[PDB]
Amino acid sequence: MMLTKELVKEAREKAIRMLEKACIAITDEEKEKIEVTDFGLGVLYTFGLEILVYVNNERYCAKELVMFPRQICPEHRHPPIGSYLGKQETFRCRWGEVYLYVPGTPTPNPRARIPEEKKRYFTVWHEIVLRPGEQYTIPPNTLHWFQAGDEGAIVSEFSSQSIDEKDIFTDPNVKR
Amino acid sequence: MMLTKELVKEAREKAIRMLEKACIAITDEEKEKIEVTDFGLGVLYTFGLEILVYVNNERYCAKELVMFPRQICPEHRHPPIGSYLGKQETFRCRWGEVYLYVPGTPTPNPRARIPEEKKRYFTVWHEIVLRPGEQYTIPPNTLHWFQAGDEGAIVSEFSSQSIDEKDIFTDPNVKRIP
Ligand SMILES: [Mn+2]
Ligand SMILES: [Mn+2]
């Protein structure tokens, strides 16, 4: 299965509707530029993310992450690059709910549900549940992953410079 | 007149309602912590701002600025501090509309309406109108001010580290720290 132009358009339209439902104004030019990634894994609705970048420069970045129901962001970390410390980010759930996993003691009875054969590539299990208004901050170079709840989620990212191409994923099949 | 605890509570409640109308979730703990400033000028509803800080650290900052109808943020700039370049910020109008003024050729027929006797302390007049979804970025140490439209405005800030206490205002009557 492959990320086609038709799948991308469908995903953009779904994400645009979710943003509208959450009352988040988006320009026509931004609507066209929403990034759709299946992380190269060919199952967008299982592993994938729809991203609106508000601003990204050498000094700060802000994005809106849209997630369809139970969409999963595969495990990654944002490493130092040259003398750049690496991206630190704060997430704020805006709508729906998200299950975020970071290093720490495994939480019993985690909310996330991962395909059995992909569990090997999820290694952190300390759970943070974020509902609308709630936040959490990930230091640079820290492993993390997240899955939206059964209605999906919109999660804001506020961070230092983003360099998506340099992110390191646990799953060696991922191409960002 | 001075900013009392009752005036602060009233302003917080109004700003909370405006956030709810814009569907922006805020926690009970954030409701108590919204900053209300009249910039020390004693006319909150003319000059003033209601601020929710989402995050502010050495590496980045994000805030929600709530503005009542025609509330004005007095002219200031975010200067370098030591070796810190100074705050760069991007504004994004979320709701309502805002009239932002930056250095440049004065725009004829500006939308803003400033009290006659305070005009002397507004020195930049190049107009940027932001409606919901629209953004503008102010480089560090750049003079700027803004006024909300007749329905008010909610404006997001995304920026490098914020150090409000170091901001320099054109109006010498302003005290940022209440
Ligand atoms: Mn991340
Ligand atoms: Mn400013």
Author numbering:
A (entry chain AAA): 0 to 175
B (entry chain BBB): 0 to 177
Pull verbatim passages from the article behind this deposition.
The conserved manganese binding site is located within this pocket and is co-ordinated by the side chains of residues H75, H77, H143, and E88.
There was strong electron density observed at the conserved cupin metal binding site, which was identified as manganese by the metal coordination and metal ligand distances. The metal identity was later confirmed using a X-ray fluorescence scan at beamline IO3 of the Diamond Light Source. Furthermore, the two monomers of TsLI that form the active dimer are connected by a disulfide bond formed between the two cysteines at residue 22 of each subunit providing substantial thermostabilisation.
